[PDB]
């Protein structure tokens, strides 16, 4: 019997925002490793060399995300298990972004020549980096609300968020509506494809970004359904704060829908 | 009962050899795409920037390759199922190295500046790229038998070979010999330390090459020991020609050793 | 049953402060043997010759030491039988630091050349050696609050404290927390590594300090769990004040946790 | 049942000879590090400063060693299970000398000023270091047949041999002969005192050598008597070639004495 | 049952005092026989000829005397049969010192040359020999309160007192305290080494005085513990009025302790 | 059963002869530490100061020795078990004489002025010392066959031989012949008294000699009758080769007489 925990989702909600600030701080520090990073010519890519750069191609990437999260917002609203759905999204987005920091600290791979006119540079001090980090944190990295002036590094987060939201939408709906599922899938592919057409991330930048989110999503649900957190000392699951969130939930979550408002 | 099939092993051994030649050939094609790739400054790193270059560290990586191969050859001869072990080795190196070809064609990445004096280049025709391919193919990519004259590309194969031969040694010996397993782990780690200290491959090319082989190794034997190729249509295995190779075997291969010669 | 003795622990806490004062006096007598101990050329070591001196490496060891002290303090606050744990830590640090005084008097082995600028010296009298011993005594020997002005001698005390605290954290916590157990081990090995990297002790001064604390901790616990202080006359236990402290404790101390304050 | 294995003692003797040769070579290499090692002022010791040097105090140690070796050989002659006794001494001496090599490599601690007149030195090449190692090997390191011409390093080997021979003489004699035991103990302590009084080693070197030999002997005999090599997977015994030698011996070796000669 | 008698103790207590004055009085008489006793060269020895004189080694003997007496006084207070213990102290010390007076009169032996400077001498009459005897009697022969200013004769009394107070401490404590017993043995041996190192008594003076007290102590307790005074006419006890002192006690005195004060 | 072994007597007889030579060898070395020892004045005694020197007092002291052993020889000649008495004389005289060597090495006490005309001295060599020792060995120390020309040291052997012979004659006769026992006792005192009257040994020289022989005699017989060599591990009797001689003898020996010859 699952117990709706309205106090644990608060801890899960706080956890994801702390990781968001940490990632913004890291990308500022790694930015000053090399001063210029606009003189190199782009590496030979099979995709970035054929299609010409489209300046407005990236502008539609977050457009699909807004529709995707809006659709996900409604199914969250019309789902009775509001604590579990929100807590399983914050406990996964907070894990992938930690893997984003590790893979960009060891090496830095950007696109040499696009968005070459972003100003700032030589942030040599202790305190003025935080002001830049604060803008990154409370800007969502959007280009409409211009904060991300020039390009980003390996393991792009635009693919992470687009793919992560798609999987919750697809399988948290009744298995008889195979018309919305293909609508979510087609939007995700165009968003990923538009990233490459904007000459902002390499071809290998997205492939390992799409694989990590997909593998981590399936590994989490399989262990949640099998209920291995207390069945046996199998492998000491390495997910950050996993058993603390799934201890009160046993079995597979149902998909019963109702109406929250008391004014029909 | 496990029936030794000596005619399928011959076909599998041919399959893996075709991959090496095909993989070597595309190395010339991608090298022709870039004029030099030996002038640019290296991208910022965490390990290639701290330690200085060690000229003799590249040879020590392949010195440990013989030890792992020599031990594996000894284990192969003293195993009753010689046709079974050799078929999986040729069926795994064929798949992993096939992915190496794919990741090289989609994106090109190398460390800019070591081994910049390799001669030849600009082989513009059809009738000497094979000549260079044959020289590399019939040199096993070693540096002692110098064929690998200058730089290599992303997803280094010097780590795939070391890791694959490390897991076969531990897997196919009795589960009480955990000292050779310890020795086979020290050799693998040192072979990875020296390939990085020699300034030959980035810190991220090694990690994504130590993970793919490990993941593809456990997944292959899990599918075998569980025997899911005929129990049920679990996932429609994507391994190239997996149902053909392992159809005639049932259960798990034991770990008892025999002697083929009749002169004790 | 475990009877919390609040009068034996006070005797155990006093016993430590006598030993620490005694050790702080021996370090003054030993320092007067050799006048200079700063002109000799250093002995040929394998770790002190490769890694160059890191100026900030010794201030980081005590940073890793305070964190282990903060974690241990929380364990002592939330434990049912906090009296016995406090009595066992004070009964073990008073024994190892007695072995440090013995090996320092028998032979003096310092590092010839760091802290060569420390002034003072030639305290030839009885009346100010006690003053010098008090300065080291009420500074805990730490390098942050400047007391450790000159060099240090054999059987490093920094390694004894770090290893003793680390083994207490992983012993008196539930055997399902294999992330704090791994975190403490990481903090222990980095604290030891920064002692060698700061050129503060030889490679053999730290190895035998880590061994003795590890051996004496395991021996003490395997001797009290089997209630060997009264089971028979096995070997006439040589631990200082062993039967006096543990005669009221029978069997193994459980791992019950509670909250002492009555204000939820 | 105790089955006398006559084909393993040869392997043990070969292993010991290889270990001795490796120790001689490592000693030569270590001595090659520091050129002079004879101009330094000696460290302040408590035994090397009080008792003045005795010129003849180093031959008495080898006299006691030869007496103990003769007694041990006499014990070996009239024992039923002489093969097992000969197989146990070698497997312990090899391990202790490997530990000696390891502790000699990390740090070099010699006595600065005895044998300052020894000539030779600066053997810089590969071709005569082997000759010097062969001389030290087939000179047994003794001072009677002059090979020990220059100084000696940490973890003295005379104390190891004396303690091992004394412990083997005490162990495998009937438990009613408590006068030969006292004689052997007196010989061992006199040998140690004569090593210390000849200004050949520091006090800490002798103390750690004695402790290590005693602890290793006791641990090995406890493991052999408790029959832990096949009882369970207790700790994966780290003794080199332990389970290979004692697998044919079950229980504790009795103390039956006989006469191998059939000519009364 | 043991009945403590407080009347026999008073009579036994004054027995030693009349003997102590008699022992002091006989010293001047034997001293008057030979005038100088401070000019001849010493007899050949094995210990007085190797080690040199240590001026402060004579005081350290009596420093250890206070500790043995201080511990014994504590035992004599926290005991329940305090009347029994003190009677045997006066009964044994009186007999041994009575022999000490006898052995000087039959033969006089001393160390020729130590303490040659004492003034006075040639006290030929009856009315100041007692005065000199009273000075030693009221000074207890100590050197801190200097009355024993120059040399001592056969059968040194510094060994009798140290050994007698050693055997009462170990015997009249519960047979589980074998650490104070170990301390009481180290305290005795050091006192025996310092009296010899001060060139105050020959190497045979100590041994024939360490044996008589030990033999006379073991004989007294075995003769009493087995209760041979009234069981049968075993040997017609030669001890001075041994039967009178121990007639009222049967069996062995237990080792239980009481507390006389009524203010816990 | 009292089994007479004629082969153990020979081993016992050889043992006493080796000690006889060893004692003579010590006498030569001990004489050389002091050059003269003939200038000192004799120590003031209670007996040597009154009784004048008698030149013929030592003439007849050995005469009693022949008479005493002649009577003992007749008792040995007319005993049923001659072997057991012979091994109880050699195994007891061979222990006392070893105690004579120990007391002469630690100190040297002789009479300064008698036998002052002894010649030779200063035998500084390695080889010709034995000729002096050989004369002492094969001279039985007799003053008639003059070999022992010069003075003698502590623990005179003249009292040892007289007392040991006296006790064997006494208790190895039936307990109804208390007329010869008095005669043997009378001879012993006169022989001892003349030794002290010959100004050859001090008063304390003989008393310590009389006690040691008597105590060791009674301690041997009590242990032989009690049969403590195999009854229990009581005290590990310290007599040399004691259990080896009494293992085959059970109980106490009777005193029956017979005739050895077969020709009445
Ligand atoms: C609690 C779950 C909320 C998840 C919603 C997305 C949050 C992620 C926003 C940035 C996270 C900070 C760290 C990433 C920094 C950038 O290096 C990163 C990679 O280029 N940019 C984005 O993620 C660009 C973000 C692309 C996301 C578009 C999908 C639609 C989300 C809209 C919700 C945000 C409200 C703002 C509406 C205008
Ligand atoms: C019994 C099974 C043995 C199979 C062992 C692996 C065979 C792989 C043959 C590779 C032939 C060329 C294809 C690779 C081209 C390079 O882009 C690649 C990465 O730089 N280099 C290597 O793989 C070469 C790296 C070499 C380092 C590993 C050393 C172990 C090799 C063992 C084979 C011994 C044969 C040596 C004969 C000279
Ligand atoms: C039973 C209580 C244990 C508490 C922690 C251990 C305290 C032991 C301090 C030793 C006192 C002086 C005796 C030794 C002197 C030196 O020869 C010795 C070796 O160089 N120094 C240390 O051990 C110095 C090593 C210091 C590393 C430990 C750091 C943790 C200190 C915690 C105290 C926090 C107070 C901070 C207030 C600002
Ligand atoms: C299983 C065989 C055990 C036999 C006895 C032990 C042999 C070990 C000899 C080691 C050979 C050289 C390696 C070590 C060299 C030195 O770093 C080391 C101390 O400095 N030497 C010894 O320990 C040398 C110790 C010397 C003291 C022992 C004396 C007994 C020797 C018996 C041989 C008799 C031959 C005599 C012929 C004239
Ligand atoms: C409670 C029972 C205590 C009885 C302890 C024994 C009492 C012995 C008193 C000796 C009286 C004079 C006779 C001895 C004369 C000297 O030729 C003799 C040897 O040279 N010296 C000692 O015996 C002197 C021995 C030196 C060693 C010190 C041992 C004395 C400790 C007891 C006295 C404590 C008084 C302390 C007051 C400050
Ligand atoms: C196991 C059989 C033992 C029987 C008797 C053996 C006596 C041996 C005594 C001398 C042995 C040499 C070691 C001692 C050397 C001297 O430092 C020692 C002390 O002065 N001399 C004597 O004891 C000399 C004291 C001698 C007194 C009489 C001893 C009885 C001897 C009877 C034999 C007479 C044969 C004479 C034929 C010419």
Tab-separated table of C-alpha atoms in Angstrom, chain D residues 176 178, chain F residues 236 238:
chain	number	residue	atom	x	y	z
D	176	UNK	CA	59.174	-31.594	28.244
D	178	UNK	CA	62.509	-26.987	28.837
F	236	UNK	CA	61.330	-29.012	36.780
F	238	UNK	CA	67.296	-28.486	38.058
